[PDB]
Symmetry: D2
C-alpha cells in the first residue's frame, strides 16, 4: 500500500464499468478502500464481490444529495475518505437539425445535469467530507479527479450539449482548486479522447483510430486509471486538465 | 447603413442595460432593427422609446421557449432576423465549494447560475439560429451571425465563484461546437469573454473594491466600457472570416484567485 | 479620419503583398501615414507609388536593427509613429523531425524559420515600441498599439511543419508577456492567428484546403485580415489577446 | 525495473542538477541506463559516479550536433536509447522590451534565450528521435517517448521576461507538432510546464521572497520539488496514451505580471 493511501478510501462514480471500473481496480490494487458508486447494480455488486473486503458497491445517483451522502458514509467505513474520481459516463443532435428545427432543450439540459451538475454535486459533497480529515504532514487532506473530454475544447457537429457540459468541467477545475486550496485538497481533471468504453467493446474501430496520431487506437480504461492514480498521488499537480487522447484533435465530424 | 445590415434585424439579450444596452445602441446606429430582450421592463421600454421605431422592447426570459419565440417574431417585423448578441449579465451565486462552517455549497445556487448563463444562452441560440437558418443567404453564403457572452472567469475562475466559472466555461466550449454545427447554414458563432466591465451591477460593489479591480488590469488600467464591448460585438458580426472564436476583452487582465 | 489615427503613422512588415498589402491599403484609407516595410522592392515601391504621398516604401529586413530603424525614421516623417502590424509572410522549412531516409531535420532550416518569424517579430516590436513609448499619450492614456501575426499552426501544428509551429507559438506566447511589459507605456499588444488565407502563393485544389474549413468554406481574404488588424488597433480595451481568424478551421495533422 | 524500461536507456539534458538531476535519479531507480547530458562536468561526474555503472556523464552542449550525438552513442552503450527528458536551462537576466531609459531590450539577450531553450530543445529532440526511430518497436507499436520542458511563463509570461516567455511558448507549441510528426515512428512527445520550482537558483532566496512566491501558489503553498517534476516526467514516459500534451506542474499557480 502506497504511503499516500495508508488509512484511506476513495469513491469512484461510474465505478461499475468502463473507465470507472478500471479506476476502481487500480485504486484497490494500490491499497485504497474503494466505493463503487453507480446505478448498474448487478455489475457493481459483482465487481465489489470479486475484489473482496476493501471494495463496496453503493447504488448512487450522482445528481441526488442523499444518494451521494450514503456513498460517502460507506467510504468512511472503509477508511478515511480522501479521494474521488468522478468517472460516470454514457445521442447526437445539431443545434439546428437537418429539417430546420432547433435542438430539443430537454436533451441539452439532461446532458448538463448528468455531466456538469452531477460532477459538481459529487465534488462539493466529497470535498466537504475530505475537508474534515486530518491533513498529512505535507498539509494535504486529499484530492479529486474530475472527468471532462477533449469535446470540451474541440466539440463536434451534433455534440454541442456534451461539448458545453465537458467545457464546464474543464473550467471548473482551476476554480475548484483555488476554492479548495485552503483545505489542502487538490483538484485536477482528465479530458479523454476516444476511449474503449463498454459500448466500443473491429471494423468501425478503424474509423475513429484514423484521426488518432499515436497510438493509433482507442485509449484503454487502464490508461485512464493510470492517469487518475497519477493525479491523486503527485503532490504538485493542481488545477490542471490533462488531455489523454493519443494526440487526437477532434474534427467536425 | 453597412451592406451586411441592410434590411436586417437583431436581438440583444440583456439589452435593457450595461453591456447589452451599449450593443443595442451600436447596432441600432449601424442600421439594424433591434429587439431589446430583457426582463427589466421600465429600462427596456425607455430605451426602445428613446431610440424610436427601429427599436422594440420585448419582455424576455431567456430560459423560456415561448418568451424567446416572441422576441423572434418581434425582430422579424423589424427586418429579417440575422443576428443576436446574448449579453444578459449579473453575478453568479457567491459561495465556496466548501464553506467556512464546513458545509458544502448550495446545489440550488450552482444550478441557478448554470440555468441563467449556460442553459439560457443555449436556449436563445437554438431558437434564433433556427430562424436565421430559414433566411436567404447573402451572395457570400452567410445567413447571419451570433455573439455569445462568456467571461474570462471561464478560463481563470475565482475563489467563491465556481458556479459562474463553470457556466461561462460551458459557453466558451459551446462556441466551436455551435460554429461547426451551424456551418452548413452559413451562420457564424463567436463569443466575447469580458474581463471586469463598467456595468451598474459591477459598480454596486463600491469604489474601494473597484479600485482593487483596476489594479490587476495592465492596460488600460480601468474597467472596460460597455461601448468597447459593443464595438467588439459589432466586429464579430461584420468580419466575414472570424468564426468559432472566443475573444478576450479584458485590458490584458488575468484573474487572480481572489 | 478616425481620431485614433489623426497625425499618426504606422509600419507594416510584409506590406508589399498579401496580408500586409491589404493592411497597408486599409490603414492608409483610414487616414494613417504608412510605411511598407518589405524586401520585395519593386512590388513595395509600386504600392507606395499607387497610394501616393502618405505611403512610403522602405526596403526592410526585419532581423536587422539598422534596417528597421530606417523604416521607423521614414514613418516619423509621415506623422507620429504609433502603430505597427507585423505581417511578413511565407512558409517555414517543409521537413519532418525524422525524415523518410531516417535522418533528422536540418537544423539550419529550423533556425532560419525561427529567425524570420519569431526573432524578426521581436526585433520589429522592440524597436517600434521604443519609438512609440516616446510619443505623447492620447487623453485615454494610450500611446499606440502593435499587432503581431502568428498562425493557428502555433496551436495545431502540422506534420512536416514543426519549425513554423514552434516560431508561431513563440509569437502567441509573446503576446501577453509583451502587453504586460508595455502596459506602463500605454502600448497595447495583440496578435492575429490566421488559418488558411488567400496569399499570393494561393493565387495559382483550393477546394482541398477549404474542405477542412467549416464556414466560410474558402480561404480567408487579405481584406478580412486587414479588417481584424484595424479592429485590434482601434478598440481601446483589447490587449494581450490572440485572435483566431480561420473560418472555424482547426488544422489536421496533414 | 519498470516493464517499459527493460533494456532501455535515456538521456536527460540539464541532468547534473535541479530538475534534471532528480529526473536522472528517478529514471535510474526505475531501471533505465541514464546519460547525464550537461556542461556542469564536476557535478555531472559526481552524480554518475554516485549512481554506478548504469549512469554515465557526457559533457553536452545542447546546441551542438556532435556533442548531442556523443551523448546518444553513450546512451546506446547502456541499453537501447528509447527516452529523453529535455530539462536544461540557464541563468537569465530580466530585461523589459522598452527599458526605463527608453532603450529597447538587447536583441542578443532575446536570441540567446531562444537559442538555449527553443533551438536547443529542437536540436536534442531531432537527434534523439532519429536514434529512437531506428529502435525495434514494442508489441504495442511504441519505440519510445520524449519529455520536453517548457514553463507556465509560455502561457502567462511576465514583465521583463518576454524572451523566456517566447522561447517556452515555442516549446509548448512544438509539442503537438512533434507528436504528429513522430506518430508514424511510434515516438510519443509530451511536455511539462513547471511553475515555480525549488532549483539551485532558489537555494539562497530569502524568507520574505519565498513567502511572496507562496502567496501566489494556491496549493501546495510552496515551490515544487525536483522529485515532483521527476515523477511527472516518469509518468509521461510510461503512460501509453498521453501524447501531444502539455502538463502544467504548478500548484495551481497562474503567473501575475510581476
Ligand atoms: Mg462506468
Ligand atoms: Mg466487497
Ligand atoms: Mg443588461
Ligand atoms: Mg421603439
Ligand atoms: Mg506580404
Ligand atoms: Mg508614395
Ligand atoms: Mg539542471
Ligand atoms: Mg557511473
Amino acid at each position: 500500500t502506497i504511503k499516500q493511501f495508508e488509512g484511506a478510501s476513495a469513491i469512484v462514480s461510474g465505478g461499475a464499468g468502463g473507465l470507472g471500473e478500471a479506476t476502481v481496480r487500480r485504486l484497490h490494487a494500490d491499497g485504497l478502500g474503494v466505493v463503487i458508486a453507480d446505478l448498474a447494480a448487478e455489475k457493481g455488486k459483482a465487481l465489489a464481490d470479486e475484489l473482496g473486503n476493501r471494495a463496496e458497491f453503493v447504488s448512487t445517483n450522482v445528481t441526488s444529495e442523499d444518494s451521494v451522502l450514503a456513498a460517502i458514509e460507506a467510504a468512511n467505513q472503509l477508511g478515511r475518505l480522501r479521494y474521488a474520481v468522478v468517472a460516470h459516463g454514457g445521442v447526437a443532435q445539431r443545434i439546428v437539425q437537418r429539417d430546420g428545427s432547433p435542438a430539443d432543450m430537454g436533451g441539452f439540459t439532461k446532458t448538463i445535469d448528468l455531466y456538469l451538475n452531477g460532477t459538481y454535486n459529487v465534488a462539493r459533497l466529497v470535498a466537504a467530507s475530505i475537508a474534515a480529515a486530518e491533513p498529512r504532514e505535507n498539509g494535504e487532506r486529499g484530492a479529486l479527479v474530475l472527468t471532462a473530454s477533449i469535446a470540451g475544447y474541440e466539440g463536434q457537429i451534433g455534440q454541442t450539449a456534451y461539448a458545453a457540459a465537458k467545457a464546464g468541467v474543464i473550467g471548473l477545475t482551476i476554480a475548484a482548486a483555488r476554492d479548495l486550496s485552503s483545505a489542502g485538497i487538490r483538484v485536477n481533471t482528465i479530458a479523454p479522447g476516444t476511449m474503449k468504453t463498454p459500448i466500443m467493446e473491429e471494423e468501425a474501430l478503424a474509423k475513429f483510430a484514423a484521426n488518432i496520431p499515436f497510438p493509433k487506437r482507442l485509449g484503454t480504461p487502464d490508461e485512464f486509471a493510470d492517469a487518475a492514480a497519477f493525479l491523486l498521488t503527485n503532490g504538485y499537480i493542481n488545477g490542471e486538465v490533462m488531455r489523454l487522447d493519443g494526440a487526437q484533435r477532434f474534427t467536425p465530424k
